[PDB]
Amino acid sequence: QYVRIKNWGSGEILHDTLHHKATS
Amino acid sequence: QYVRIKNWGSGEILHDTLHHKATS
Amino acid sequence: SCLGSIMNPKSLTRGPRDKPTPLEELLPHAIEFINQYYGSFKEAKIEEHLARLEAVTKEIETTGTYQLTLDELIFATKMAWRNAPRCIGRIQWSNLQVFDARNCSTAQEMFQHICRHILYATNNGNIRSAITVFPQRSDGKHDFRLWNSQLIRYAGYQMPDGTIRGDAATLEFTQLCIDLGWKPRYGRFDVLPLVLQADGQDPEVFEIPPDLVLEVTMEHPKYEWFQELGLKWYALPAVANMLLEVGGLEFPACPFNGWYMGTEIGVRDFCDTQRYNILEEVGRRMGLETHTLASLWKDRAVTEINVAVLHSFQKQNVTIMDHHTASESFMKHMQNEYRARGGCPADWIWLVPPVSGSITPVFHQEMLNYVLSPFYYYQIEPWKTHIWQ
Amino acid sequence: SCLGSIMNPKSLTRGPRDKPTPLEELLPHAIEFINQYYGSFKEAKIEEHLARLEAVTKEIETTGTYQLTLDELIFATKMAWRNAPRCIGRIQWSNLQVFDARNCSTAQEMFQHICRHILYATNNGNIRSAITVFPQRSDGKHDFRLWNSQLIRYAGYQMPDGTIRGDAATLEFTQLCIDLGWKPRYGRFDVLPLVLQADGQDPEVFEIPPDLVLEVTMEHPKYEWFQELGLKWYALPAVANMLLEVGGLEFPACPFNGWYMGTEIGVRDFCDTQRYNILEEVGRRMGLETHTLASLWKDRAVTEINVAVLHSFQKQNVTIMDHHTASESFMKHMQNEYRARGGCPADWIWLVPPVSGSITPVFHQEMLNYVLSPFYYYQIEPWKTHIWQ
Numbered sequence A, B: 001q002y003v004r005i006k007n008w009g010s011g012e013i014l015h016d017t018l019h020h021k022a023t024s
Numbered sequence C, D: 001s002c003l004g005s006i007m008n009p010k011s012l013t014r015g016p017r018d019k020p021t022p023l024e025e026l027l028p029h030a031i032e033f034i035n036q037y038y039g040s041f042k043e044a045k046i047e048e049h050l051a052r053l054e055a056v057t058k059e060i061e062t063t064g065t066y067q068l069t070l071d072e073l074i075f076a077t078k079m080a081w082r083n084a085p086r087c088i089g090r091i092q093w094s095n096l097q098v099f100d101a102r103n104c105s106t107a108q109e110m111f112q113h114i115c116r117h118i119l120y121a122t123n124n125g126n127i128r129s130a131i132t133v134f135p136q137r138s139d140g141k142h143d144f145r146l147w148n149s150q151l152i153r154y155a156g157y158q159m160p161d162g163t164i165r166g167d168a169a170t171l172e173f174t175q176l177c178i179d180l181g182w183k184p185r186y187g188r189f190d191v192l193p194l195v196l197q198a199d200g201q202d203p204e205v206f207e208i209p210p211d212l213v214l215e216v217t218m219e220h221p222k223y224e225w226f227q228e229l230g231l232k233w234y235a236l237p238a239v240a241n242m243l244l245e246v247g248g249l250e251f252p253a254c255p256f257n258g259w260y261m262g263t264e265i266g267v268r269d270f271c272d273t274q275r276y277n278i279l280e281e282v283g284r285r286m287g288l289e290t291h292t293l294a295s296l297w298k299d300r301a302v303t304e305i306n307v308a309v310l311h312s313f314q315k316q317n318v319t320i321m322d323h324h325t326a327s328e329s330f331m332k333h334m335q336n337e338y339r340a341r342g343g344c345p346a347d348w349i350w351l352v353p354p355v356s357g358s359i360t361p362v363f364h365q366e367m368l369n370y371v372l373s374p375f376y377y378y379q380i381e382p383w384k385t386h387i388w389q
């Protein structure tokens, strides 16, 4: 899936998918 | 065991044992 | 990926229920709490200890739940405090005042307990730490909730001319408030109404008696134009929407309060772009190079707004604390704590002031953030789950 | 317990080896890297891609290891940069200069490459980002290491009269340096010698050619007494002891550098109690209420030391960046990144300036910290594991 990441200054949100490639 | 925790300002260290009581 | 930087992680939230909590889990939790408590007594009482362990077990099986002794609750509210990873004031943990409203039943009874609280705690400016525990969650369908994020808070309206007035952070709650019949006074500093939900009933609105909301008019000790910004803030930081969890029990309503640490009003409330956002006006009115970031004018301004805030609270005799003193205080707490019980759940991302980071000692201290029990959890916003009449 | 607040977590360190790294792990890692690389080309080259995949596999089996094409290394150093959770400058990731010293063999050859580096990068004050990759770790017994934490750094001595002079942070490395034959010049700003270990051999000391260390004399643009504090700092932030990991390979020696962000010298080097610790002298010399923390004098001082630092670098034409601009920059990077590849490993505890916390936009941004590959790891300090001749 993806992690919902938010910016409290601008209310903006982003969906992190790259973490999947994290090493162990 | 215990986690070694350090203070870079004073070089001081502490050994955390309480975390064991952490809930899940 | 370490998600340390997230504001409301699920790990820190304790959501709604639909049925009592399973004895399988409730019981061992209760035994854990009772042992904690008796275990805390310098000089034990095994007789009593064992008796209580038994009594609770019975009750839990004869009723599927249990009630705490006022003494146990007083111990729960403080330990929960003591175990609040995000609080710098914990050196004061053992100094709390507990108002037992566990026998409350109506919203008007709530509105009265809250007033007794707001009044006890404000103390004409000499702030006292206090908490008010309402009835514990039972079947999850009779929960007592305060829909406010905090007892005294200012409204935030969206002006006709497109401009946002007041505290934009509460624009939404404010609408709801209005939707529930509150009369919008369209000010910049209009104290929001208490929105109370008792025994599971739809929420009810109540204006806070003006005489109860102590306020501090902002004035800088060198700048005469500071006062011309006509700014002020409430003297009481009272968190209104958190859940207290102790020995398996959940108290979804339990407002608590301390005093203010200057940088909250100083930096966050006033300077955050998504709040009162006053940094540029203060910059300009200082003659600073408001159009070149490299001029470090923001660093310059914000420190004056901070001196204003502190100056004003002292001048008006209202309790307040600067971030430096706060930090040295927490540092000493932490050590008492490691000595006292070898550990201290601490969340660095929060424990570090929003200004003067590394000038503060907590910035240079490694911390371990973990959730113990009792604990104060976050909750899903009521209007999101509440089932309406 | 989330251990986000620890400085050197094991997760972030890549320690010493004793034997080549197992093909079982080395191979799949290499395939991963090669795919990354070919996958990065706008317009692919499957022919070449497949050919390389094969070539590498062969080599790995015919030699138990492999060598990167200069092109692949250039791509490794930048991606590793791009994936540095603790760097605010990553918006500049694609702009790095790579010096391939993979064919080095002696310490004097090292000392020469480092000089070419220090010189290329300083550029008479117009700083350029660069990296110098030495020979990759092979059997773990022939590792190339730089014993310094950073290329140019000041020594720290423990005076006879009990007082510590210079940078206390390097008191230990300094002794060692002295133990290895370096002549202590007992100053407050004595540039430390390069201590190089090549092909596994005991470490060798080399003084950095004075003409190569550009320095900035500190002077405030209003305070004439600033200059009287006789303070200065080096213009080049060059990390010297990190390990580069790419496709299974480990380069234990690979100094890299960027330019400075003012608050490093400003707040950390000068103001940290465990560093040059100049906060009180600057306080006093400002007439501030140096004995009442609530006066907010530290906040006041530190901002001036920051203006001094920035002012000096600009006046002397040396590249520098203020924390505000740095932060807005990183914010834009992050967005490019989420758009470019949906994610950005970021460590908030580090990405937030040590002063002006919330006035900065990164403070209000939620981040996910995770270790990808390629990556720059930390290492155990050599003198702790090194086996002496």
Ligand code: HEM
Residues within 6 Å of the ligand: C077, C080, C081, C082, C084, C086, C087, C088, C089, C090, C092, C096, C129, C130, C131, C239, C256, C257, C258, C259, C260, C261, C264, C321, C350, C376
């Ligand atoms: C001595 C008076 C007190 C002071 C100076 C103090 C100060 C603070 C500060 C500065 C914060 C960070 C707040 C933010 O970023 O919004 C905080 C958070 C917190 N404090 Fe306190 N505190 C006080 C009393 C208490 C008490 C008595 C309790 C427990 C009954 C408590 C529980 C908490 C909790 C739960 C939070 C986190 C709220 C959240 O997550 O939004 N505090 N406190």
Ligand code: HEM
Residues within 6 Å of the ligand: D077, D080, D081, D082, D084, D086, D087, D088, D089, D090, D092, D096, D129, D130, D131, D239, D256, D257, D258, D259, D260, D261, D264, D321, D350, D376
């Ligand atoms: C555009 C020039 C650059 C600027 C302004 C910059 C700025 C910074 C800053 C302010 C920090 C936090 C440092 C601290 O707390 O000590 C940092 C850390 C770091 N930067 Fe950069 N950087 C630059 C270039 C680079 C480059 C080119 C690389 C990759 C080759 C890089 C890799 C790192 C790493 C690995 C760290 C962490 C070091 C540690 O853990 O001690 N930086 N950088």
Ligand SMILES: Cc1ccc([N+](=O)[O-])c(Oc2ccc(C[C@@H](N)C(N)=O)cc2)c1
Residues within 6 Å of the ligand: C149, C150, C237, C238, C239, C256, C257, C258, C259, C260, C261, C264
């Ligand atoms: C008890 C206590 C003591 C002291 C302070 N303080 O010094 O700032 C407190 O602050 C606050 C104020 C508001 C919130 C968040 C709340 N508005 C909403 N969920 O957004 C959290 C801490 C709270």
Ligand SMILES: Cc1ccc([N+](=O)[O-])c(Oc2ccc(C[C@@H](N)C(N)=O)cc2)c1
Residues within 6 Å of the ligand: D149, D150, D237, D238, D239, D256, D257, D258, D259, D260, D261, D264
């Ligand atoms: C590449 C680069 C670019 C830019 C900066 N910068 O702007 O400050 C850097 O800083 C540093 C300086 C020193 C350290 C730590 C080092 N001394 C030692 N392990 O303690 C880490 C980051 C590094």
Ligand SMILES: C[C@H](O)[C@H](O)C1CNc2nc(N)[nH]c(=O)c2N1
Residues within 6 Å of the ligand: A008, C005, C006, C007, C349, C350, C351, C352, D348, D363, D364, D365, D366, D367
């Ligand atoms: C969680 C997110 O990083 C957010 O910006 C932060 C960080 N640190 C904080 N620290 C405190 N004390 N209070 C806050 O509201 C926040 N919010």
Ligand SMILES: C[C@H](O)[C@H](O)C1CNc2nc(N)[nH]c(=O)c2N1
Residues within 6 Å of the ligand: B008, C348, C363, C364, C365, C366, C367, D005, D006, D007, D349, D350, D351, D352
């Ligand atoms: C890790 C420990 O919390 C330490 O004090 C910190 C925190 N944040 C930091 N952030 C940066 N950029 N650099 C540091 O050296 C540190 N050290």
